[PDB]
A paper describes a structure:
Crystal form 2 was obtained when a hairpin DNA was used. Crystals of both forms were dark blue, indicating that the different DNA ligands, each with a Cyanine5 dye tag, were present in the crystals. However, after the structures were solved, the DNA could not be built into the structures of either crystal form, which resulted in a higher Rwork/Rfree gap during refinement. Some broken stacking electron density was observed around the 2-fold axis of crystal form 1 and a solvent channel in crystal form 2. The unsolved electron density in crystal form 2 was not in close proximity to the active site identified by the metal center. This indicated that the DNA was present in the solvent channel but bound promiscuously. Crystal form 2 contained two Artemis molecules in the asymmetric unit and, for both molecules, residues 3–361, except residues 54, 299, and 300, were refined in the final structures. The three copies of Artemis were very similar to each other, with a root mean square deviation (r.m.s.d.) in the range of 0.37 to 0.60 Å. The restructuring of this loop and the coordination of Cys-256 induced a ∼40° rotation of helix αF from its position in SNM1A and SNM1B. The same position of helix αF was also observed for the structures from crystal form 2.
Human Artemis, 692 residues in length, contains an N-terminal catalytic domain (∼370 residues) with nuclease activity and a C-terminal regulatory region for DNA-PKcs interaction. Based on amino acid sequence analysis, the N-terminal Artemis catalytic domain has been classified in the β-CASP (CPSF, Artemis, SNM1, and Pso) family with a β-CASP domain fused to a conserved metallo-β-lactamase fold. We found that Artemis displays an overall fold similar to that of other members of the SNM1 family and CPSF-73 but also shows unique features, such as a novel zinc binding site in the β-CASP domain and a distinct substrate binding surface. Artemis is able to process several different DNA substrate structures, such as blunt ends, hairpin ends, 5′ overhangs, 3′ overhangs, and symmetrical bubble DNA structures.
Numbering used by the authors: 3 to 53, 55 to 298, 301 to 361
Write the structure that this text describes.
Amino acid sequence: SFEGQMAEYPTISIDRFDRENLRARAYFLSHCHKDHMKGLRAPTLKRRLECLKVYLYCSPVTKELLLTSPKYRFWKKRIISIEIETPTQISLVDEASGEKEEIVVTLLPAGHCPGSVMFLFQGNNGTVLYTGDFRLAQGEAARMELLHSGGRVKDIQSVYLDTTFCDPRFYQIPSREECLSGVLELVRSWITRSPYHVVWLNCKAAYGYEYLFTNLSEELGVQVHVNKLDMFRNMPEILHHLTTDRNTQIHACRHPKAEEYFQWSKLPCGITSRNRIPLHIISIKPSTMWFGERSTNVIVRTGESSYRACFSFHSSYSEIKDFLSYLCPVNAYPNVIPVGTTMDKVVEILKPLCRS
Ligand SMILES: [Zn+2]
Ligand SMILES: [Zn+2]
């Protein structure tokens, strides 16, 4: 994984808050996933804040979701939200020496989960882009204005990028539109059969499924059952598509025993029936599917009442190549070395997409 520090601007820490990141002169959070929040509520950091003034920068939506959780509220006076595509000047103060450094940061949508951004940094040590976690369609980098000067791609020294699926194995992954379309039609065909036909969307406990929930709710006029929606209380574009009311045909609720429940025709929220009549439940499990270069269906049946539906939080190998090729940075560094590859193989895929 990425240890928080870009070589070009090492006095700021991104998506990593422990060890050497404890001495950072400014903090950045790309998005509100635990993989990118290590040490963020470490007592040693709660104290290092109080002893003097360092800030955490992030998207307005990221600030809302972060400050919703009780454990992070100590950040409240120390978070500065930056609007999307708004170049902003930040002052970095060396505590020991009193030296001031000036950097500009620009937040670009990363298409990962709500509030997820890339950080574009400009200053004395070159231009660098930290992608965080990102899913962008092929051709999307050419349509980002603030990666351009006078219709020309900006001169970028280093791109630090989401290499979750950086291998030709994950050559092609269906778009979020194709994924949504597949889920929409499976759900539609099921819940229109009668009022006792309900869907359980088996989703991990992590932001990034809302796009699914909000679009199912618009097209079908049915709110999605969730354990908690208070994180979205000041976000009407999401909130109004969700409910804590169990009386709905679409559930994204969660329970430790959800699997044994489903076996007994019980939703995680513990209902088996409506007006004494047992419900008809299908499970749909969003899960990453991929296709090799020289090798179909986003919906896979797994049982009489169970389905896997293609869904990805990270770009395909093809989408990585497209993004990085277009930017043609001097350097490209992987934010992650997945379990099934190595630094040398990922560098071997990245180096040819760089300048020279
Ligand atoms: Zn993530
Ligand atoms: Zn439920």
